[PDB]
Amino acid sequence: TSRNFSVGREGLEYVWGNHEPVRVWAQESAPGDPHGWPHEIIIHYYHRHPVYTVIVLCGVALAILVGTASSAACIAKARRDCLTPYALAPNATVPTALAVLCCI
Amino acid sequence: FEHATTVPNVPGIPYKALVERAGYAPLNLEITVVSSELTPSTNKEYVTCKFHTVIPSPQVKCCGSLECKASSKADYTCRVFGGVYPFMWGGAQCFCDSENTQLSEAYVEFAPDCTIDHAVALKVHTAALKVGLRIVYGNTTAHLDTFVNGVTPGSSRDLKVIAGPISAAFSPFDHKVVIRKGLVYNYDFPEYGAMKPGAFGDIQASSLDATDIVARTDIRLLKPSVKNIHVPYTQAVSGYEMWKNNSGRPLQETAPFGCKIEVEPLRASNCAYGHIPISIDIPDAAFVRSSESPTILEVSCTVADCIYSADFGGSLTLQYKADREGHCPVHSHSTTAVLKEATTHVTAVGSITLHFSTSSPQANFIVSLCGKKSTCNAECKPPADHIIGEPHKVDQEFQAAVSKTSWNWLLALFGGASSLIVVGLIVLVCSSMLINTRR
């Protein structure tokens, strides 16, 4: 027959019949490349912390997205409270460089 | 001259360090653990094996009457019966044909083969730890054994050393332990005196040759049906035999941290857990003042290919212009990259190759020769094989487990968003100021 076992970074020990014990340890040979494109950085670290990547790689890739969502939001903040005060001179004229953003 | 370090508790793995005395040339040091033991304190409860039911020869009184006394033997039982009229080969044995009482007895003993097949019941307590070290310093070696408690000084006459305490408490032994022919089990047995029939510990005694034995085996006596002569009885099964059918696997195949379980006396040998602090005092004659060592004049670190694996997967070569001849040492300074040599032979102009092992996706450590420093940097490829037969030499921390390329990405995108809001905010206070300028 044939049987399947899983090893970790600490190790495993197996005894078969009247023989002596044998010990094995694991290494870090996962696909991808930690020096190529961002395309293949992710497949490397994801495999390495798989059950942690649902915390650790999906964690950090997520906080990346929220940062760029919250940032591009609060930049629209500045547009609100600065564009509106410009046109508060009805029947007047301003520099064109700002007279181009008040229409939109 | 004192020096204190921490050592990981794994056998057969040297740990290197260098002591920097202000006045002399530096000194190399290596500390290896050769064997450890863990021995608890115990005391004995009782011994147990299979029992042997002894049934004596009954006594009869022809046409009188009998009644029972009481004795001290193990699980004594007695009963009297009515008119019987019993028979043997020669014929009838009494002369009054009724009123013929008869008496019956029974008790238990130890089988004659129990001198090889028995068990012992023990209670255990706090554990102690004791290690054997090999220490090299300069040009001498030394062996010694100490107790890791915190106070007790060490060993022989040339080198003071004190260890302890341990950074984690761990014992594989529970509060109750059984021993049979060299195998150790974790069981929960009844006390001394709480016998119950059909389970482990139905017969108990303090030694194999004692005279006071207690037992409870649920024996009851019946009335004879056929009239020749005999005594019938029924009994429960022996708990010893029932336990041997559902024992389980021994402790030599369940102990965590990969330990060896040995008896006579009870101990666990060569476990691997936790960190150990060590203070050491070095004799003064082994330091050599600075005016004798070589003096070097330049150094440069060139690194060839590397792998980050559990064995020696790298290389480098230095370039020096010394001033004399000598044997000054080398050393790594980073806790994620370990060297293999200790000292070298030096000359006027030359080079030297050394081998190392690492656990980081890029090498960025410092190397010291004769006391002078130099920096090395390159990139390190992931390994090829999947399984090997060695233990890893260095641990793995969060900082240098991510490449430098990845760090350039994660930084600029992250801080790019934050840098967008600060300009987005200073325009507002400007705007208001312009609005304040507008008034």
mmCIF file with all atom_site columns, C-alpha atoms in Angstrom, chain B residues 338-406:
data_model
loop_
_atom_site.group_PDB
_atom_site.id
_atom_site.type_symbol
_atom_site.label_atom_id
_atom_site.label_alt_id
_atom_site.label_comp_id
_atom_site.label_asym_id
_atom_site.label_entity_id
_atom_site.label_seq_id
_atom_site.pdbx_PDB_ins_code
_atom_site.Cartn_x
_atom_site.Cartn_y
_atom_site.Cartn_z
_atom_site.occupancy
_atom_site.B_iso_or_equiv
_atom_site.pdbx_formal_charge
_atom_site.auth_seq_id
_atom_site.auth_comp_id
_atom_site.auth_asym_id
_atom_site.auth_atom_id
_atom_site.pdbx_PDB_model_num
ATOM 1  C CA . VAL B 1 338 ? 26.235 31.909 11.158 1.00 0.00 ? 338 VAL B CA 1
ATOM 2  C CA . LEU B 1 339 ? 29.816 31.128 10.134 1.00 0.00 ? 339 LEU B CA 1
ATOM 3  C CA . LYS B 1 340 ? 31.723 27.843 10.101 1.00 0.00 ? 340 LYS B CA 1
ATOM 4  C CA . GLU B 1 341 ? 35.392 28.567 10.818 1.00 0.00 ? 341 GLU B CA 1
ATOM 5  C CA . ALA B 1 342 ? 36.947 30.005 13.961 1.00 0.00 ? 342 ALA B CA 1
ATOM 6  C CA . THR B 1 343 ? 40.465 31.219 13.129 1.00 0.00 ? 343 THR B CA 1
ATOM 7  C CA . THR B 1 344 ? 42.734 31.581 10.098 1.00 0.00 ? 344 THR B CA 1
ATOM 8  C CA . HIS B 1 345 ? 46.395 31.840 9.118  1.00 0.00 ? 345 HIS B CA 1
ATOM 9  C CA . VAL B 1 346 ? 47.430 35.218 7.736  1.00 0.00 ? 346 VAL B CA 1
ATOM 10 C CA . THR B 1 347 ? 50.247 36.656 5.627  1.00 0.00 ? 347 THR B CA 1
ATOM 11 C CA . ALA B 1 348 ? 51.254 39.825 3.790  1.00 0.00 ? 348 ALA B CA 1
ATOM 12 C CA . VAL B 1 349 ? 48.736 39.849 0.922  1.00 0.00 ? 349 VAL B CA 1
ATOM 13 C CA . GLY B 1 350 ? 46.160 37.174 0.293  1.00 0.00 ? 350 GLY B CA 1
ATOM 14 C CA . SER B 1 351 ? 42.589 35.972 0.409  1.00 0.00 ? 351 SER B CA 1
ATOM 15 C CA . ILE B 1 352 ? 40.459 33.403 2.205  1.00 0.00 ? 352 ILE B CA 1
ATOM 16 C CA . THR B 1 353 ? 37.150 31.666 1.545  1.00 0.00 ? 353 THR B CA 1
ATOM 17 C CA . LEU B 1 354 ? 34.626 30.963 4.293  1.00 0.00 ? 354 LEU B CA 1
ATOM 18 C CA . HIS B 1 355 ? 31.299 29.134 4.302  1.00 0.00 ? 355 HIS B CA 1
ATOM 19 C CA . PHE B 1 356 ? 28.074 30.214 6.012  1.00 0.00 ? 356 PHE B CA 1
ATOM 20 C CA . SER B 1 357 ? 24.376 29.430 6.383  1.00 0.00 ? 357 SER B CA 1
ATOM 21 C CA . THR B 1 358 ? 21.442 31.815 6.444  1.00 0.00 ? 358 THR B CA 1
ATOM 22 C CA . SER B 1 359 ? 17.677 32.054 6.770  1.00 0.00 ? 359 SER B CA 1
ATOM 23 C CA . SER B 1 360 ? 16.976 35.413 5.119  1.00 0.00 ? 360 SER B CA 1
ATOM 24 C CA . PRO B 1 361 ? 16.195 36.123 1.456  1.00 0.00 ? 361 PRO B CA 1
ATOM 25 C CA . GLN B 1 362 ? 19.175 38.479 1.277  1.00 0.00 ? 362 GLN B CA 1
ATOM 26 C CA . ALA B 1 363 ? 22.505 38.727 3.060  1.00 0.00 ? 363 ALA B CA 1
ATOM 27 C CA . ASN B 1 364 ? 23.193 42.063 4.739  1.00 0.00 ? 364 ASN B CA 1
ATOM 28 C CA . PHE B 1 365 ? 25.498 41.288 7.657  1.00 0.00 ? 365 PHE B CA 1
ATOM 29 C CA . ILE B 1 366 ? 28.834 42.544 8.974  1.00 0.00 ? 366 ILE B CA 1
ATOM 30 C CA . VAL B 1 367 ? 32.007 40.486 9.291  1.00 0.00 ? 367 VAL B CA 1
ATOM 31 C CA . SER B 1 368 ? 34.914 41.169 11.641 1.00 0.00 ? 368 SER B CA 1
ATOM 32 C CA . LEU B 1 369 ? 38.468 39.964 11.094 1.00 0.00 ? 369 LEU B CA 1
ATOM 33 C CA . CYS B 1 370 ? 41.258 40.666 13.590 1.00 0.00 ? 370 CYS B CA 1
ATOM 34 C CA . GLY B 1 371 ? 38.849 43.296 14.916 1.00 0.00 ? 371 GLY B CA 1
ATOM 35 C CA . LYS B 1 372 ? 38.107 45.188 11.675 1.00 0.00 ? 372 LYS B CA 1
ATOM 36 C CA . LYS B 1 373 ? 34.648 45.409 10.139 1.00 0.00 ? 373 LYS B CA 1
ATOM 37 C CA . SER B 1 374 ? 33.260 45.151 6.613  1.00 0.00 ? 374 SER B CA 1
ATOM 38 C CA . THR B 1 375 ? 29.829 44.863 5.019  1.00 0.00 ? 375 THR B CA 1
ATOM 39 C CA . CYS B 1 376 ? 28.372 42.342 2.572  1.00 0.00 ? 376 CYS B CA 1
ATOM 40 C CA . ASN B 1 377 ? 25.217 42.457 0.464  1.00 0.00 ? 377 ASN B CA 1
ATOM 41 C CA . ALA B 1 378 ? 23.645 40.375 -2.313 1.00 0.00 ? 378 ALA B CA 1
ATOM 42 C CA . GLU B 1 379 ? 20.467 38.422 -3.032 1.00 0.00 ? 379 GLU B CA 1
ATOM 43 C CA . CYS B 1 380 ? 19.738 34.850 -2.097 1.00 0.00 ? 380 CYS B CA 1
ATOM 44 C CA . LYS B 1 381 ? 17.706 32.290 -4.054 1.00 0.00 ? 381 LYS B CA 1
ATOM 45 C CA . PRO B 1 382 ? 15.173 29.867 -2.549 1.00 0.00 ? 382 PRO B CA 1
ATOM 46 C CA . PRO B 1 383 ? 16.230 26.243 -2.115 1.00 0.00 ? 383 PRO B CA 1
ATOM 47 C CA . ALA B 1 384 ? 15.722 23.354 -4.496 1.00 0.00 ? 384 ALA B CA 1
ATOM 48 C CA . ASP B 1 385 ? 15.162 20.201 -2.436 1.00 0.00 ? 385 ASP B CA 1
ATOM 49 C CA . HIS B 1 386 ? 12.111 19.678 -0.240 1.00 0.00 ? 386 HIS B CA 1
ATOM 50 C CA . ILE B 1 387 ? 13.172 17.362 2.617  1.00 0.00 ? 387 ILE B CA 1
ATOM 51 C CA . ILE B 1 388 ? 16.573 16.931 4.287  1.00 0.00 ? 388 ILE B CA 1
ATOM 52 C CA . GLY B 1 389 ? 17.934 15.158 7.344  1.00 0.00 ? 389 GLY B CA 1
ATOM 53 C CA . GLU B 1 390 ? 19.344 18.000 9.448  1.00 0.00 ? 390 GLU B CA 1
ATOM 54 C CA . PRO B 1 391 ? 17.999 20.578 11.899 1.00 0.00 ? 391 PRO B CA 1
ATOM 55 C CA . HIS B 1 392 ? 17.895 24.265 11.099 1.00 0.00 ? 392 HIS B CA 1
ATOM 56 C CA . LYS B 1 393 ? 20.695 26.286 12.643 1.00 0.00 ? 393 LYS B CA 1
ATOM 57 C CA . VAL B 1 394 ? 19.133 29.758 12.950 1.00 0.00 ? 394 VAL B CA 1
ATOM 58 C CA . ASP B 1 395 ? 15.650 30.992 13.848 1.00 0.00 ? 395 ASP B CA 1
ATOM 59 C CA . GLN B 1 396 ? 13.365 33.228 11.782 1.00 0.00 ? 396 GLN B CA 1
ATOM 60 C CA . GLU B 1 397 ? 12.102 36.682 12.748 1.00 0.00 ? 397 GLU B CA 1
ATOM 61 C CA . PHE B 1 398 ? 9.570  38.899 11.031 1.00 0.00 ? 398 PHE B CA 1
ATOM 62 C CA . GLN B 1 399 ? 11.892 41.748 10.066 1.00 0.00 ? 399 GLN B CA 1
ATOM 63 C CA . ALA B 1 400 ? 14.341 40.063 7.691  1.00 0.00 ? 400 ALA B CA 1
ATOM 64 C CA . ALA B 1 401 ? 11.932 37.486 6.299  1.00 0.00 ? 401 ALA B CA 1
ATOM 65 C CA . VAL B 1 402 ? 10.784 39.801 3.494  1.00 0.00 ? 402 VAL B CA 1
ATOM 66 C CA . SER B 1 403 ? 12.903 40.866 0.547  1.00 0.00 ? 403 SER B CA 1
ATOM 67 C CA . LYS B 1 404 ? 14.138 44.375 -0.108 1.00 0.00 ? 404 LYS B CA 1
ATOM 68 C CA . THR B 1 405 ? 12.331 44.617 -3.444 1.00 0.00 ? 405 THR B CA 1
ATOM 69 C CA . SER B 1 406 ? 9.048  43.902 -1.676 1.00 0.00 ? 406 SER B CA 1
#
